[PDB]
C-alpha cells in the first residue's frame, strides 16, 4: 500500500455553522468510500457479468412486469380531484341542512368573528396552501 495519500483531514472547527452543511460534507466523503464498496466485497467483475448476462439473455422480463408497472405507476399517482367526492357529500348535507333548518342569524355573526380570532397564525399555513401549487 504505497498509495498512502493524506485524506485524514477530519472535521475542523469551521463547519459548525449550518449543521445541515456538515451532513452534506460528510455524505460526499462517504460517497467516495461508498464507491469502493462495489469493488472490495465481491470477487470482482461480478457486476460486468451480471449486467452483460441480462443483455445476452435479454429475451424475457418486462413482459410480465409490463402491466404491473402501469398499475404501480398509475396507482402511485392517483391523487384524484377528491373535490367532487367531498363536495358531493358536503353539498348533499347542505341541501338537507337547509331543509331541516335555516342557518339562524346572530350565531352566524358571532361564529364568524370567533373564526377570525382562531384564523390568526393558522392563516399563515392555510394562506400559503391557497393560491399556491404543490410547493
From Swiss-Prot:
The chain holds residues 61 to 195 of 195 of the full protein. Interacts with ITCH. Interacts with humanin; the interaction prevents BID-induced apoptosis. Interacts with MTCH2. It is found in: Mitochondrion membrane. Induces caspase activation and apoptosis. Allows the release of cytochrome c. A motif (BH3) lies at residues 26-40. The modification Phosphoserine is found at residue 18. The record marks 15-16, 39-40 as: Cleavage. Ubiquitinated by ITCH; ubiquitination results in proteasome-dependent degradation. This is BH3-interacting domain death agonist p15.
Amino acid at each position: 500500500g504505497n498509495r498512502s495519500s493524506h485524506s485524514r483531514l477530519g472535521r475542523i472547527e469551521a463547519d459548525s455553522e449550518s449543521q445541515e452543511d456538515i451532513i452534506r460534507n460528510i455524505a460526499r466523503h462517504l460517497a467516495q468510500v461508498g464507491d469502493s464498496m462495489d469493488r472490495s466485497i465481491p470477487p470482482g467483475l461480478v457486476n460486468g457479468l451480471a449486467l452483460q448476462l441480462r443483455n445476452t439473455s435479454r429475451s424475457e422480463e418486462d413482459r410480465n412486469r409490463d402491466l404491473a408497472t402501469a398499475l404501480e405507476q398509475l396507482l402511485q399517482a392517483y391523487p384524484r380531484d377528491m373535490e367532487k367526492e367531498k363536495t358531493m357529500l358536503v353539498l348533499a348535507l347542505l341541501l338537507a341542512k337547509k331543509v331541516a333548518s335555516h342557518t339562524p342569524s346572530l350565531l352566524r355573526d358571532v361564529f364568524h368573528t370567533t373564526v377570525n380570532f382562531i384564523n390568526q397564525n393558522l392563516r399563515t399555513y392555510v394562506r400559503s396552501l391557497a393560491r399556491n401549487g404543490m410547493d
